[PDB]
Structure 1
């Protein structure tokens, strides 16, 4: 099956664009990346940086995740991100989202060898 590291890339990486260019970015990406296949995922975040720079966060500042685990890390610098949040008109299979573009530090959980991101915890 798809590995946790591969799933993180599919759900949270968009190195092909520097930022969301329109209000329809989330509606198109949530569908294209197959995140609305079984149900409308309520919230998701896409990171507009090189995969290498995001993977490097696993060697930066260690912080506890929201749930208490201690394998989470916060990026030293801010990154270009896009937050997708389900709107009131969203109804499966026609999931709808609001696109919000911002520059924030990201916090990810890391696992494995190579030690890489497998979960997006938050943006601060």
Structure 2
């Protein structure tokens, strides 16, 4: 049974590439990470940094979560990320995404012992 930490890794971690997102990156990644299974997940961010680096964010800048909770953290440094955003023409089950590479600070929610990322809140 998938832990929240494991789900975060599946939904949000892609340490395999430096950028290097083809115009096709999101189409393929959203499907393979199972984010197009029950619906087209409309927005999803993949982070191209080491797991250690992203986990480290849980001890970085404490910031308010969008939901009003206090357990969110913003990375001190910008991180390589790919924003995946459903296109206007996209229709389930043929989910289609615009791929946008950027370098931005990430904000994640962390929980548990060990204290680890469980939710992607924002990129700024």
CA drift at 1:18: 0.8
Deviation at 1:15, TM superposition (A): 0.3
Query: What residue in structure 1 maps to residue 26 of structure 2?
Result: 26
1:41-91 deviation per Cα after TM superposition (whole angstroms, max 9, x unaligned): 000000000000000000011000112110000000000000000001101
1:21 deviates by 2.8
TM-score of the pair, normalised by structure 1: 0.98
Summarize deviations over 1:9-66 as a string: whole Å, max 9, x none. Answer: 0000000011133100000000010110111000000000000000000001100011
Structure 2: tracts of 5 or more residues without a match: none
> TM-score, length-normalised on structure 2?
0.98
Q: Does the Cα contact within 8 Å between 2:21 and 2:82 map onto a contact in 1?
A: no
Which residue of structure 1 aligns with residue 61 of structure 2?
61
Distance 1:36 1:20 in 2: 22
Q: Give unpaired runs (5+ residues) of structure 1.
A: none
For residues 37 and 5 of structure 1, what CA distance do their matches in structure 2 show? 20
Q: Is the deviation greater in 60-69 or in 3-12? A: 60-69
For the residues of structure 2 that align with 1:90 and 1:20, how far apart are their CA atoms? Answer: 23
State the 4+ residue runs in structure 1 displaced beyond 4 angstroms. Answer: none
2: distance between equivalents of 1:49 and 1:115? 18
The Cα RMSD (Å) is 0.6
> Which residue of 1 is the match for residue 8 of structure 2?
8
